[PDB]
Amino acid sequence: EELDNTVRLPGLANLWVPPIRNRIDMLSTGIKSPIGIKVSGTVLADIDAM
Amino acid sequence: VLTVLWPLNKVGGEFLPQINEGDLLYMPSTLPGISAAEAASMLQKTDKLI
Amino acid sequence: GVTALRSGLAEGEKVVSSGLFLIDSEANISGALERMRSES
């Protein structure tokens, strides 16, 4: 608590987590939302609009 | 059993596990497009605060 | 290392130099940059 209140800078949104648990979360390719939507295509311009 | 079980389930219910290690990990994220100079400076700023 | 604006400010005014990135980002999150641009 003291750290999150001491250590902080503009724009820099703070966050705290465990080392091992983080490393797992890291290399973890995947999606956090219970429901996700993948709109794939040929040109980014189009899908981004979708 | 039925009577005590019913209002005893409607109580709190939150995400599953958490394992706290001795030392902790600090991840603070900012906007993208930061220079390896400012980002390095940024790193020192926070570390001195920590 | 010194740009020159044709218009947009007023002599005497102050403007940030160092830490300019973080601050701009903070104001971007804050919705300031969004606000400024919307105020017209």
């Binding site: 902080r8 800078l9 503009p10 | 700023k45 605060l49 | 010194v2 020159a4 400010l9 007023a10 002599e11 005497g12 005014e13 102050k14 403007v15 940030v16 130099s17 160092s18 830490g19 973080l22 601050i23 903070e26 104001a27 804050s30 300031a32 606000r35 400024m36 105020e39």
Partner: peptide, 26 residues
């Protein structure tokens, strides 16, 4: 309001430096 107020004790830690606008030739 406009802009954004930032805690003075943070901008101090950041080491924010400022320059003054002026009119003259480049």
């Amino acid at each position: 309001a406009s802009g954004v107020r930032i805690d003075p004790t943070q901008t101090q830690n950041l080491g924010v430096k400022t320059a003054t606008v002026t009119r003259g030739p480049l």
